[PDB]
Design a protein around this ligand. Structure first.
Ligand SMILES: [Cl-]
Ligand SMILES: [Cl-]
Lengths: 298, 298
């Protein structure tokens, strides 16, 4: 339907991979910088920061596998294509299609999970890594308590076996996506968002298959993603890529643990700063987020 | 067209300051109050209550807000659906019947009212039996990844209104049937009398009733937990002789060894597992009934 182009001047690319197409907006010139969104959003969440990044970088703003307009690989009982390991492999393959075998990467939310998993699996692929408002999946599950269970209830809700979350999400999908967007902002409403961006999120979320993928992602988040992280924790594997951890002063990551302290256990070279924002750093605090990312990546 | 599942039981609408309590009443002898839980109504006792009625005056009540009991208006603290409030309301209901001292068996939410009744008002109870629960405090305190996945609904249903209400309203039937099925040993509805399922489904079909259940769960995440916390940290133990029954495949045994937990909460607790999922009186009626009769009797 009525979907605004929020990346004027960016091209739109369908990048083929062995697991399906990745949709991306591509703008800018210079070193490649891949931007990955998370839930329940699409690549358009970068629309306020991408132009500023594209002043200095070839900015590739990709829909995650299964999200947005990217193809949805068929899942399996292990949710394999929606594990962050598989998504990272698919995005690596997509970047290779562009000739980008060494790139900068900033991820937000699920996209940040892809990113740090990418950085653990294939750190050679990354010059620099920024993660916005997450802790590693293992840390969320390790710190799981009453308070976090309530706060990130959707981690266990969306990970319920199908079709339970699918059916429930189906009961009022517009409400649910708006409810997630609003409830994780500082304002608590949709006012931080561009209505046209919210329109993108609403439409993607209106598709049952897209919602199923999101549950697949969360199922992976509860199962294989956790196991993969656990392996790294237990082997002492650290991200060797210089990395920036940004978190909302009232985002999700500061609810579980002090994020820079946490990320320092996961990464050898991490800097970090809070942004006066809820979860949606690039939309609630675009100038601050864009500034931090530009300074770090450039 | 809801079946009478208690042939020969009377029906009582018991006035309390907080609304009427519906109950079926049958039998003669010492009063025994049976309290159901979620997402059920008093009819879950229909297989065991006749055996109990051979020896006790059996009062099979709908919890405040459940079944045909009135639905006191909730508030921001979910007060009427805290187990403390529900217990005080059922104390008043029993008082209306002249029962100021009575035996009590509860299942699920009803078990939570029960042990809270026993902590708050121990002198009202001759004996207490709780079925397939641990204290609310213990469930939250043990809320790790595994358990957050198992009883995700503890955090989902406790989300602020109207999020769960809105999701549940799209297809209520699905969710009540899913919960009944998922917590049984068999993982389907075969343990239930279909006429009982229809009671549960009809209750669940009312949005107000569904809201009450969420209010119960909200109370469960907040006030109920706080009240329990006070008691645990104060070393307040239930003094009333108590039977803890749980399903070998039920929920309680997922968190911890139930008897060891209950021994922390109760000075005089005996416990037996029953080969059953969560729905002991329906999955394992003869065994449950025998356990209760034995325990409550001389
Ligand atoms: Cl790993
Ligand atoms: Cl039944």
């Amino acid at each position: 339907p009525d979907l605004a182009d929020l990346f004027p001047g960016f091209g739109s690319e369908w990048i083929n991979t062995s697991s399906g197409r990745i949709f991306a907006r591509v703008g800018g010139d210079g070193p490649p910088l891949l931007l990955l969104h998370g839930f329940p959003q699409t690549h358009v969440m970068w629309h306020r920061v991408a132009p500023k990044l594209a002043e200095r970088f070839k900015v590739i703003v990709a829909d995650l596998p299964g999200y947005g307009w990217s193809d949805m690989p068929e899942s399996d009982e292990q949710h394999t294509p929606y594990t962050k390991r598989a998504m990272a492999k698919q995005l690596i393959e997509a970047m290779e299609q562009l000739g980008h075998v060494h790139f900068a990467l900033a991820g937000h939310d699920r996209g940040a999970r892809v990113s740090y998993r990418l950085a653990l699996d294939s750190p050679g692929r990354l010059s620099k890594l920024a993660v916005l408002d997450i802790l590693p999946t293992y840390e969320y599950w390790q710190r799981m308590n009453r308070a976090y269970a309530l706060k990130i209830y959707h981690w266990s809700f969306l990970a319920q076996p199908a079709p339970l979350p699918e059916n429930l999400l189906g009961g009022d999908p517009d409400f649910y996506v708006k409810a997630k967007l609003a409830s994780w902002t500082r304002a608590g409403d949709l006012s931080a968002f561009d209505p046209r961006a919210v329109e993108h999120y609403r439409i993607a979320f209106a598709d049952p298959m897209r919602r199923h993928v999101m549950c697949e992602d969360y199922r992976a988040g509860a199962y294989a993603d956790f196991e993969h992280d656990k392996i790294d924790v237990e082997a002492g594997n650290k991200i060797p890529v210089p990395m920036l951890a940004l978190w909302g002063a009232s985002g999700i990551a500061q609810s579980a643990a002090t994020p820079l302290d946490v990320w320092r256990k996961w990464a050898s070279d991490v800097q970090g700063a809070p942004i006066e924002s809820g979860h949606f750093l690039p939309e609630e605090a675009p100038d601050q987020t864009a500034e931090a990312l530009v300074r770090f990546f450039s």
